[PDB]
Amino acid sequence: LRKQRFMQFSSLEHEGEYYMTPRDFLFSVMFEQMERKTSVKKLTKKDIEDTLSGIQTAGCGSTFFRDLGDKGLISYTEYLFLLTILTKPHSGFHVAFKMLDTDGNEMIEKREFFKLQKIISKQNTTLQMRFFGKRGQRKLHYKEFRRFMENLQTEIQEMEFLQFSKGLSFMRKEDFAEWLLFFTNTENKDIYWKNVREKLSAGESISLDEFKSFCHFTTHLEDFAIAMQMFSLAHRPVRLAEFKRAVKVATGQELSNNILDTVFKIFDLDGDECLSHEEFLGVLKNR
Amino acid sequence: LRKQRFMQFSSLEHEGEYYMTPRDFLFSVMFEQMERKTSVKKLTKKDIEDTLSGIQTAGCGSTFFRDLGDKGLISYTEYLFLLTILTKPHSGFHVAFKMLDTDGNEMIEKREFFKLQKIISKQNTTLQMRFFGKRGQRKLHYKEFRRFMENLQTEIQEMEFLQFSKGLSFMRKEDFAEWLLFFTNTENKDIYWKNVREKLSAGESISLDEFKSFCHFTTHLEDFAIAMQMFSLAHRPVRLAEFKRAVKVATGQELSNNILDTVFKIFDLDGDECLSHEEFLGVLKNR
């Protein structure tokens, strides 16, 4: 029923063709319940020039949505298209491109409408403008498409960093708990709150790189879990350095001990300073 | 009882000499109730090198607190010293400097301790380090002191901008309502919410300059009110252009009609499109 949610956060509709503002989406992925819209504004057909006027100054980097800020053409189809690229690790990236016609955008331009017409059988966008110029112009090959993949992932990731560090460039090790708790959704288990309230010492912080890497690590969650099959069945709880080289070869993204020690310090309720499979992975499969 | 609040947000104490982290203060002025500290950390006397190590990379501009991020020596005395410079407009700036010995920091160095000893009769800081080098070295004249005044005002102002625009460089005209409502504290009067819900159209946004100017305009609130005495007793409600030139000569800071029209559109409940004294000023004196 994602469509019904898409109606909630969206406030721009055209004969039922609800267009999403760039902010609504970013709010649909950051916040969970927001209702202040009270608007059917876009009916005046300013849309056809509204977006194209403002997209001409878009930041191709990690600000492609932090540059427009609630003005842009985002269709419900494209909305879901971001949801699927939300969860793609590096592995699926080439495949997600290869899932499309893979013969260059000459065969992938129509795939956009094909993306649209797919939802129809089931029953001028900002991206298409950035992907195909004005009327199907730009030849957005894989790497160019891949560029748009990672930064937009980083973007939603990055903006999340501020929402917990309250804008400051540093996130208290205690703040980093809620994000994990908001991730694992096992927050009602006070034992972890009991764990963090004493085991964690309110001290230094975590920068964006250490957090953005960790968030990216979870994008590759599965490949890590498989590399932990031999140990999970062995039930031997993992040590820090073991866990580092593990996630190293698992995701390809190194982490900082300043994170995982806390991750250990919060997830090692057994008190052995070693993460068994049911300790970390067990709660991670709550959602 | 501000001291009792200072205890809440602070988490670093030394024989009762509670030192404030740079973030606690910024959280004490942005948030209102926060309790996650659970720490008496600084007892290990790492403080004497903790701050001085990190302050060496401080951004002298509008990031002097967005540069350290919860590591710094902020005394309860200095805490209040920021509270008083929080509310100073440009007028009091020279005076606030002139309230001190005014004979150059040679007579103003001791004023820092004098600031401290003042609270004692009543019953190595980060700033002093930035104000007097290491042991009473730097001669922070007025303009240099004034530099620290405005940016720190801008800083707390700026960080507030993100907290409502949710990090995005643009603040929805609807977001700008709550800030005013959080300012006027007349939010329980649904008529304004009734006003904004229909009169305001969810559309374009407001940048930082238009907001930071407006926030600065309220720093000079009184001088504006006096320039409105002749009109308030006249009871004639003010027009936009009239209001512009008014706040122009009042604060010295021009605004954008995109703000005040909404301010009009939200505060003109009488429906005459003209702000009477009791309309705007009347609710502004609620706090």
Of A166, A168, A155, A261, residue with least CA distance to A215: A155
Partner A, chain B 65-84, Cβ-Cβ below 8 Å? 66-67, 69-71
CB contact under 8 A, B168 and A11: no
**C-alpha distances in Å from residue B193, one per residue of B178, B200, B266:** 10, 10, 8
Task: Considering only the beta carbons, identify the residue of B71, B201, B204 that sits closest to A39.
Answer: B201
The whole-angstrom separation of Cα B143 and Cα B35 is 37
**Way the structure was solved:** cryo-EM
Q: Encoding tokens for residue A149?
A: 């993949």
Task: Using a CB–CB cutoff of 8 Å, tell me whether A170 touches chain B.
Answer: yes
Composition of chain B by helix, strand, coil, percent to 5: 60, 5, 35
Name residue A240's amino acid: L
Tokens at B18, concatenated: 């509670």
Tokens in use for A212? 């953005």
Instruction: Tell me the C-alpha distance between A197 and A100, whole Å.
Output: 48
The alpha carbon of residue B118 is apart from the nearest alpha carbon of chain A, in Å, by 31
- Asked if B36 lies within 8 A of A174 by C-beta distance, the reply is yes
Query: Please, which residues bridge with residue A182 across strands?
Result: none
Distance, first Cα to last Cα, chain A = 18
B35 at A interface, C-beta within 8 A: no
- Closest to B70 (Cα-Cα) out of A195, A207, A209: A207
Check the annotation: does A105 bind a ligand: yes
**Cα separation, A211 vs A171, whole angstroms:** 9
Task: Round to whole Å and give the CA distance between A153 and B226.
Answer: 52
Q: Are A264 and A201 in contact (CB under 8 A)?
A: no
CA distances from A80 to A11, A29, B161 (A): 17, 11, 30
Judge whether A205 and A172 are in contact, CB under 8 Å: yes
Distances in whole angstroms, Cα of residue B123 to Cα of each of A41, A204, B116, B119: 59, 33, 11, 6
- Contact between A80 and A50 under an 8 Å Cβ cutoff? The reply is no
A37, A41, A63, A166: which to substitute to probe chain B, counting the most B Cβ within 10 Å?
A166
Annotated binding site of B for Ca(2+): 101, 103, 105, 107, 109, 112, 268, 270, 272, 274, 279
- Give strand pairing partners of A74: A20
**Crossing angle of the two packed helices A257-267 and A208-219, in degrees rounded to 10:** 60
DSSP string over B203-221: --EE-HHHHHHHHHHHHTH
Chain-chain contact of A168 with B203 (C-beta, under 8 angstroms):
no
Picking from A41, A162, A202, the nearest residue to B167 by CB comes out as A162
Is residue B159 within 8 angstroms of chain A, CB to CB?
A: yes
Q: Which of A89, A119, A95 is nearest to A251 (CA)?
A: A89
Length of chain A: 287
Longest dimension (CA), chain A: 64
Question: How far is residue B109's CA from residue B136's CA, in Å, rounded to a whole number?
Answer: 6
Tell me the C-alpha distance between B245 and B264, whole Å.
Answer: 15
What's the DSSP call for residue A205?
A: E
d(CA A102, CA B32): 54
**Token representation of residue A282:** 């067990």
Tokens representing B140 are: 């922070």
Q: Could you tell me which of B140, B126, B127, B157 has the C-alpha nearest to residue B97?
A: B140
Contact A132, A140 (CB under 8 A): yes
Instruction: Give the dihedral of Cα atoms A151, A154, A156, A157; nearest 10 deg.
Output: 180
Pair of tokens at residue A254: 């190194």
- Interchain proximity B167–A163, CB inside 8 Å: yes
Q: Is A116:A125 a contact under the CB 8 Å cutoff? A: no
Check whether A270 is labelled as a binding-site residue: yes
A174: chain B residues, CB-CB within 8 Å: 36
Interface contact B39-A71, CB threshold 8 A: no
Q: Which of A163, A170, A203 sits opposite B69 (nearest CB)?
A: A170
**Count of other CB atoms within 10 angstroms of residue B161:** 22
CB B170 within 8 A of CB A69: yes
- Resolution (Å) of this entry: 3.6
The residue among B21, B29, B68, B168 with the most chain A CBs within 10 A of its CB, best to mutate, is B168
